[PDB]
Amino acid sequence: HHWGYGKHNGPEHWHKDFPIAKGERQSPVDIDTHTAKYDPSLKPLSVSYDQATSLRILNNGHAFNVEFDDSQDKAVLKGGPLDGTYRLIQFHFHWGSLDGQGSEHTVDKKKYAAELHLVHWNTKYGDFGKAVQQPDGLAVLGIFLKVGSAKPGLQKVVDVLDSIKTKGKSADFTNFDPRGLLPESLDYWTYPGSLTTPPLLECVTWIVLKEPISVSSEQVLKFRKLNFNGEGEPEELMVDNWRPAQPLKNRQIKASF
Ligand SMILES: NS(=O)(=O)c1ccc(C(=O)N2CCN(Cc3ccc(F)cc3)CC2)cc1
Numbered sequence: 001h002h003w004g005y006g007k008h009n010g011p012e013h014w015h016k017d018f019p020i021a022k023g024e025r026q027s028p029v030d031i032d033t034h035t036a037k038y039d040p041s042l043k044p045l046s047v048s049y050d051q052a053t054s055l056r057i058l059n060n061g062h063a064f065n066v067e068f069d070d071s072q073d074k075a076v077l078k079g080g081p082l083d084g085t086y087r088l089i090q091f092h093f094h095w096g097s098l099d100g101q102g103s104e105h106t107v108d109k110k111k112y113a114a115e116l117h118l119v120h121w122n123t124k125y126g127d128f129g130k131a132v133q134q135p136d137g138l139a140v141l142g143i144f145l146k147v148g149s150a151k152p153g154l155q156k157v158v159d160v161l162d163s164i165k166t167k168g169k170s171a172d173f174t175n176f177d178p179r180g181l182l183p184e185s186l187d188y189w190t191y192p193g194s195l196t197t198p199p200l201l202e203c204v205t206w207i208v209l210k211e212p213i214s215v216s217s218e219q220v221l222k223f224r225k226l227n228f229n230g231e232g233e234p235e236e237l238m239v240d241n242w243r244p245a246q247p248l249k250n251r252q253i254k255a256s257f
Pocket residue numbers: 001090117119140194195196197198199
């Protein structure tokens with residue numbers, strides 16, 4: 001793969017290697033709040049992260065992933081629009097070079113400074129690789145970040161970034177509690193979509209929280225010091241690693257509230 005977020009290999013180029021980029025249920029999308037319809041049939045979302053076991057943090061050249069042990073039903077997402085149990089495997093963020101951009105989903109065209117994605121796979125499929133080949137294989141919980149007060153629960157992530165500055169670097173990252181990254185309210189919008197990076201597979205039930213979390217300018221500034229490049233290569237700051245909104249096509253966004 002040679003895809004990325006640069007002028008020559010960015011989102012507008014992805015369709016050449018990944019034709020599904022122009023598919024029928026691509027993500028992210030703009031969430032038009034006035035058109036989204038309240039669905040009273042939606043169940044309350046269930047986020048059970050008390051037994052979450054984080055293991056490592058990795059700079060993969062596109063973002064950084066905080067990985068979890070998903071070999072057992074520990075941290076799971078269920079309820080809401082979901083049927084079954086989805087296991088947390090990793091979380092990562094997308095952010096911008098400026099506070100005025102960075103999120104993938106937008107709300108009434110508003111772009112947030114960043115967006116957190118907690119990725120879960122449907123246990124009925126056995127493993128993540130098999131799950132991404134199914135229309136209901138993944139559930140990604142998206143949370144917007146705005147710049148204001150610091151998020152205490154995010155600081156451990158911010159402080160370890162120095163150790164994984166470049167592509168391919170990883171660091172032990174145990175005992176991190178993802179509950180510290182959640183907003184107060186679990187109200188959400190949901191729609192069927194896709195992974196937002198190649199392979200862009202149409203296997204995701206998106207659940208995007210209405211309430212953003214606040215992070216400090218210093219916290220997001222640290223994200224912007226990461227590198228897309230590997231050690232010993234020309235420095236390319238890891239910023240604007242977000243895909244813009246895609247055509248909604250034949251889909252309806254439902255609201256839980
Ligand atoms: N942002 S998002 O939609 O929330 C998201 C969620 C999960 C993932 C994820 O774990 N990888 C998907 C990509 N693959 C690498 C890959 C890339 C291109 C290919 F053709 C095949 C595999 C590693 C696993 C990526 C993005």
